[PDB]
Amino acid sequence: KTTLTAFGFASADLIEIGLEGKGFEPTLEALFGKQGFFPDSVNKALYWVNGQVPDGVSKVLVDHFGYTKDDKHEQDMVNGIMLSVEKLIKDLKSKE
């Protein structure tokens, strides 16, 4: 929002766009929470996909998505991504 006072002492809101919403936190956590889609999905993709991102990007990825070096699951790329998808689907209707 912005209020303009350029007509002497007469004021007038030049423009205002009002955003109102609730229930964002559950989706925020289902995307980036402990069981969120992004952390597990990125971890599985990094484990099953050859090659590592530059070290600078690697630090951020480890910090945010909790990439794990070693996994004992002979489950494949498809199941690795699909576990994250499954938990996200449960996240969707398990909350607001």
Swiss-Prot record:
It comes from the Eukaryota. This is Apolipoprotein B-48. It comes from Homo sapiens. The gene is APOB. The chain holds residues 674 to 769 of 4563 of the full protein.
